[PDB]
Amino acid sequence: AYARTLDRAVEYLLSCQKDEGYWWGPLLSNVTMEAEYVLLCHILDRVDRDRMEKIRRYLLHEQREDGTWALYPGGPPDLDTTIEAYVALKYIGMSRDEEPMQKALRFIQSQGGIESSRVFTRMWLALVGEYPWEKVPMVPPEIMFLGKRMPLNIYEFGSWARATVVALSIVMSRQPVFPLPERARVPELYETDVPPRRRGAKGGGGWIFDALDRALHGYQKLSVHPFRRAAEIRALDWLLERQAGDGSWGGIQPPWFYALIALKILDMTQHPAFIKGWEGLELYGVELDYGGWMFQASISPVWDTGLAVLALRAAGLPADHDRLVKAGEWLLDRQITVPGDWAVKRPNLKPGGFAFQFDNVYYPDVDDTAVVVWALNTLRLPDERRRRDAMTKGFRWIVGMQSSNGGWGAYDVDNTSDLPNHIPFCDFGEVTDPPSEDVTAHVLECFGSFGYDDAWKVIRRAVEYLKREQKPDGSWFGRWGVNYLYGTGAVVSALKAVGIDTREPYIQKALDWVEQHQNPDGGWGEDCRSYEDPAYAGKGASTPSQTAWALMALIAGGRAESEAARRGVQYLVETQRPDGGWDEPYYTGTGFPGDFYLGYTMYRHVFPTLALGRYKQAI
Amino acid sequence: AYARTLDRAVEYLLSCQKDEGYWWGPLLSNVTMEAEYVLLCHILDRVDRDRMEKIRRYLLHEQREDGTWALYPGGPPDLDTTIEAYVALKYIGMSRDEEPMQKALRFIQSQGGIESSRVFTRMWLALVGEYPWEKVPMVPPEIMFLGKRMPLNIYEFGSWARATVVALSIVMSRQPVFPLPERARVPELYETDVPPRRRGAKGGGGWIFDALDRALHGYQKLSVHPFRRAAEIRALDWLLERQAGDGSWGGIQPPWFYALIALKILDMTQHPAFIKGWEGLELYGVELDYGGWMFQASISPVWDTGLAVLALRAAGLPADHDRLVKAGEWLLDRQITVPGDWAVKRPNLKPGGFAFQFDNVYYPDVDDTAVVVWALNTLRLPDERRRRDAMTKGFRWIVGMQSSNGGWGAYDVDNTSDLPNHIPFCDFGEVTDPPSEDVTAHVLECFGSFGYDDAWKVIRRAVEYLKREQKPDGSWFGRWGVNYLYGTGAVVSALKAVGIDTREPYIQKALDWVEQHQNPDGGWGEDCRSYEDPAYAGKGASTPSQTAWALMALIAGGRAESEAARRGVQYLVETQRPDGGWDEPYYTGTGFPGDFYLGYTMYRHVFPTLALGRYKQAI
Ligand SMILES: C=CCN(C)C/C=C/COc1cc2c(cc1F)c(-c1ccc(Br)cc1)nn2C
Ligand SMILES: C=CCN(C)C/C=C/COc1cc2c(cc1F)c(-c1ccc(Br)cc1)nn2C
Ligand SMILES: CCCCCCCCOCCOCCOCCOCCO
Ligand SMILES: CCCCCCCCOCCOCCOCCOCCO
């Protein structure tokens, strides 16, 4: 019955695998990426007409009926995303007259205009001279003087926000302006009678920070800024020391773009760092079959490879499959062996974690590391020496990354500072990197394969963390994945592998929750709105991945041989495509709860296989 | 008569010109370059058998009868050069038994052995574990803390030594050891009864520095070095900020090699700076027709192009020659417009100088700048706008570079500190960059073309400098060129263009000197020994370049229509090759008086043409 489904899904994943022996599917987000890229070229005075066209097709394509752009497919119209997309188009050639511009422009006005956009949006528009810097949250370079154990030090922010703050400090220090041609001027973004509904800080704004910001802008007008010269250099060197091998910064788009801009402001366009940092963009770019072009906010080569292996293994393929070996070998060469920003909190910790993308040694995450190691622990490589040693290194690294609450963060340890969540600047997505449920689960899921049970303290502390974080309805929040079906499925799956009894009360209360949200079509679905409105928790169009997750939660809970269980399996078997793949016009990945959403392409193929793989094990 | 010589010499230079429209002839030095390169690969664990072979052929080829290696062709056997060459060979595969090794080894012993080699030689041998660091001049990273106006600050050294000191400070801070295979161990370098004749500091060694060094080695053994961590980072960032575009450091081999080593010691082999810095070496490498391979200590693309243009112009080719335009355009794109280490002494000075090699923005020299600008002032480019503006920028830069004594240095201003010339480490070549005669002359020669005469103060101050530096025999020392025939020819040529009366006493006393050294073959020659023994001042085998220089000194002095004048011309006309070129098995370039000698390939073709060009003008 489901056998044919697996055999087809298996041969498919194996066909998507590259020559090197790894998997790498595109990462979807929103048009703000391409929109900002267009402006970046303008700033760097490196515009390519041919490329612009590919970007124009893309922008319009992603535009919906109403003429707006959302963070995720089938989501509400996002102001910011639309504003940036609007400016980009008009700059490429579009005229405010054309219908696509009309519907979009009207929407921007019906929301208060530019005065209702995030800081970033207003910042870029400020970089082009379409918005005064005076009304933009100030971030002085002096922040580089804050010691290791002081309030608001660059090391109290999230690895992702950190690099951005350091890069921007230099940019905002000079407050450069790169005028746009009269033909691109977008003053209409102001014409509006609707009251400006500005967005406050993530965790709220205190009068202190509000005043401090006003003070900075004032000090920013003085004729002499003592030690600011060194302050900037401190930021410049900081970046130069942590530049990714591919030329990026952190492997993400934000700091990368701002870093280049910072270098441009310092007349370092002929410096190796800049050269490399620029030509490295092409790697993240993608050619769309319909003549479009997009820029991935990031790449998941390692991540895809990791999951893919686990999926195929749990499916049936031998532990020494010559094709899987290509991956095992590849992964081993990805392991990081040099201290990163994480060392600041764990100096006596030996490097051994992996990154998300190709080359990003200074920012290895716990999630990838856990998956990669666990993926290798299920393979038989010709050289049991490096495989045995690699796992050990990564294993110990993870253990040394466990926070105080027993949980595991993503990049840093105990990075739970609540100060940066009030700064006027920080008003989009997360700013800190505190321990999460999903990540922790994946960690326990890793140790489980080795045998380590609840007897080991480290495991217990983690379990306690999960128990205290479990939601009232017995569900678990999803940090890097939409959403509760993702978290719950991850936790239960982990707790089952760590030895914990699946008959436990809180456990059962979780499984029941899963069956209570099984859509009519037999599949499971959870829209991204679950982050904004709780009424969507477990609700939404069914998807191959989400269905697989909620499916694993049952298979692990022992309800693999149940009604709702066989029900979901039927969905995956039917919805499957002739080629053995799966479609998924909805995002299932999460970057920032209610701010940034991602769409992992492989998820629709990997997980569905992993789910069926474990289902074929219960029998 | 000489017409045919010119027409042939002209069509030749035009054939050597590359497509881009520039000239670039190889730069010769000694085997220490390749020798150290071999060790570099060992250190970086990146050895290429195929390449090693090409290096072996080269080494042996450059070895003379006695089995030694000299700094220049036909020069005395150099210990250092031989030692490093010996170690390199034995590492490639050579056995201490083979004749080439025997004769070389014996020479090394007959000089005291390794204990009689320069600091660098002993340093590399220390990097491979063949020499104890304890007996190597210490250079602590703490030197990076010395302010701008303090004793022995990195900015008191020569631009070339500076980068080296900063890079090595990190290397010597860790004193790393990279063991050589037992087959390459070179203990025989110690077996010697001859007393070790060590080389002292350039300007002598004071008991202070001698003691200070002993103190450092002691402090180097302690268990805790406070602030040394930051001291290193200060050096690391310093390098990262000034890395050449081609991936080098200063455009020279020394700092480049040590910089890479430093990065390797910091586990930054996967950092962009390193990657770029490594793959950039190939650009300086050269494939020898006889299967050999060499590494240019530096490249003279800009320098060659500059002189070549002036030569062809003074020859007869139109000021708008379509072929010369290719150069004019190319040169304009080479002009630097960003602050360099020179800004430390001249913050209010606008960038406009040029570099010696392709991409080296942070180290523009006065010599090249003067030549390039002066070369453009004799051309008619389609865009008189950038040509007029370029000259102005470079012109003003040079003026702002004039030292206190009215003379012009090479890279920095008033860099005449006499403190670094006593440090135990500095014992090879120059360490500072004080004003020179040749450079200054070239500067005046530049202004002269514009019209600025002795009336202008800046010119006068320069002339006074030259007058006070003129040697007793009415000759002028040659800093970057062997030697007195080079300096004298440069000065007289300049003083003639600045309006100064060529009938002047000190002037005539110079011309007479030239005629008094005209070899019987009608040509002029000056061996490099002129730096060690004064009895060689103006003596040595005649060469196309040197003959041309001493020839210009006469043509400028008004003695163009003299006996010795027409005599030299005859030499150039006869010694000329069928293809219109010229041979020169002797070096005429100078890096460090009595330490490092260079051989500019184009010199044998350019100058000879320039000389004949000006000779055809006197008539
Ligand atoms: C579970 C998988 C691995 N796990 C470890 C999550 C990491 C995913 C890497 O991809 C991204 C990470 C990002 C981002 C985007 C990614 F695609 C941003 C980000 C996005 C927009 C703005 Br504005 C600022 C930051 N921050 N961070 C950490
Ligand atoms: C008159 C021509 C231009 N003028 C401006 C001289 C510059 C020549 C560039 O070539 C070199 C410069 C060098 C060196 C080598 C070159 F080929 C070294 C050097 C060599 C050996 C060691 Br050991 C240390 C330094 N230092 N410096 C400045
Ligand atoms: C990053 C702070 C920007 C301040 C730059 C002003 C530079 C002042 O030049 C003084 C002399 O130092 C020369 C160095 O330039 C080398 C590269 O360093 C990068 C930014 O200039
Ligand atoms: C240049 C200092 C050498 C000290 C090396 C110890 C490495 C520990 O790093 C401390 C943690 O800071 C995180 C940064 O790593 C970035 C790259 O800088 C390169 C070498 O330090």
Curated annotation (Swiss-Prot), chains A, B:
Chain ranges passing through the membrane: none
What the record says about temperature is: Optimum temperature is 60 degrees Celsius.
What's in the keyword line of the UniProt record?
Answer: Cell membrane, Isomerase, Lyase, Membrane, Repeat
- The positions flagged as active site in the entry are D367
* Pathway membership: Secondary metabolite biosynthesis; hopanoid biosynthesis
| One annotated Gene Ontology cellular component of this protein | plasma membrane
| UniProt key word Lyase | yes
Q: Which gene encodes it?
A: shc
* Catalytic activity, reaction form: squalene = hop-22(29)-ene; squalene + H2O = hopan-22-ol
Q: What is the stated purpose of this protein?
A: Catalyzes the cyclization of squalene to two pentacyclic triterpenes, hop-22(29)-ene and hopan-22-ol (diplopterol); hopene and hopanol are formed at a constant ratio of 5:1. Is a key enzyme of hopanoid biosynthesis; hopanoids are components of the bacterial cytoplasmic membranes that play a vital role in stabilizing the membranes.
Q: Which superkingdom heads the taxonomic lineage of this protein's source?
A: Bacteria
This chain belongs to the protein called: Squalene--hopene cyclase
